[PDB]
C-alpha cells in the first residue's frame, strides 16, 4: 500500500508535495504512519513513537530524491544520520531501530502516567503503545511485575495509591531516555525522596 508519511520538527513543503505527487498520503499520527521524515534526532512524541514501532526514520533527501526518480525510492540510503545527537544522547539510531524491529521494548509492561508529567498522559500513552506496552488510563490498585507508574514531584497526591500497593514510581526519563536508546532500565529511573 501507498506510504503514509509523518514529519516531525520540520516544515518540508517540498517533501509534502513529493508525498502526494508520488501517490502516498500524509500520516495523521505515528500509529497510522509507515514513514517518519525529519532532519535531526529530536525527543518529540512523533520521533519517540516512530522509533518505538521501528518504522523507517528518514532524512529530507528521501522524498526529494524520490520525486526526481518519479517513484518512491527504497529507504535504505536515507536513514537519518545525526552523529552530534547520537553522541549527545549516547546511542545509535540504527542500533536502536534494529532493537525495535527485533522486539517490542515494553512488551509485558503496564504503565500509568500521573496528570502533571511531560509529555502529558495521553501523549506519553501513545509512546507506550508504540513500544508494545499497555497504557493504563485508570489508576492501578494492585501490584503486578512490570506494572509501573510514571510521575513527578508535584504529583505526590496522585502517588497515594501506587505507594500503598507497592508500585514503583519512575521519572519520565525511563521512557524519554529508554525509548530513544530502545533500552528499558526501570531500576535506574526510580524516584528518590
Amino acid at each position: 500500500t501507498a506510504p503514509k508519511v509523518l514529519f516531525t520538527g520540520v516544515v518540508d513543503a517540498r517533501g509534502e508535495r513529493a508525498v502526494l505527487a508520488l501517490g502516498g498520503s500524509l500520516a495523521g499520527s505515528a500509529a497510522e504512519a509507515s514513514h517518519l521524515v525529519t532532519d535531526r534526532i529530536r525527543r518529540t512524541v512523533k520521533f519517540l513513537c516512530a522509533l518505538g514501532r521501528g518504522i523507517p526514520i528518514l532524512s529530507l533527501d528521501w522524498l526529494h530524491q524520490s520525486r526526481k526518480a518519479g517513484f518512491f525510492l527504497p529507504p535504505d540510503e536515507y536513514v537519518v544520520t545525526d552523529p552530534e545527537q547520537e553522541k549527545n544522547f549516547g546511542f545509535s539510531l540504527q542500533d536502536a531501530l534494529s532493537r525495535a524491529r527485533e522486539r517490542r521494548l515494553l512488551e509485558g509492561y503496564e504503565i500509568y502516567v500521573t496528570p502533571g508529567v511531560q509529555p502529558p498522559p495521553p501523549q506519553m500513552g501513545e509512546i507506550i503503545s508504540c513500544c508494545g506496552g499497555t497504557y493504563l488510563p485508570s489508576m492501578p490498585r494492585s501490584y503486578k511485575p512490570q506494572r509501573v507508574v510514571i510521575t513527578c514531584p508535584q504529583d505526590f497526591p496522585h502517588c497515594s495509591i501506587p505507594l500503598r500497593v507497592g508500585l514503583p514510581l519512575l521519572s519520565p526519563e525511563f521512557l524519554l531516555t529508554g525509548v530513544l536508546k530502545q533500552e528499558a532500565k526501570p531500576e535506574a529511573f526510580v524516584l528518590s525522596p
Binding site: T8, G9, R43, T44, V45, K46, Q118, P172, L176
Partner: peptide
C-alpha cells in the same frame, strides 16, 4: 512547533 522533551 512540536514540543521537544
Amino acid at each position: 512547533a512540536s514540543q521537544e522533551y
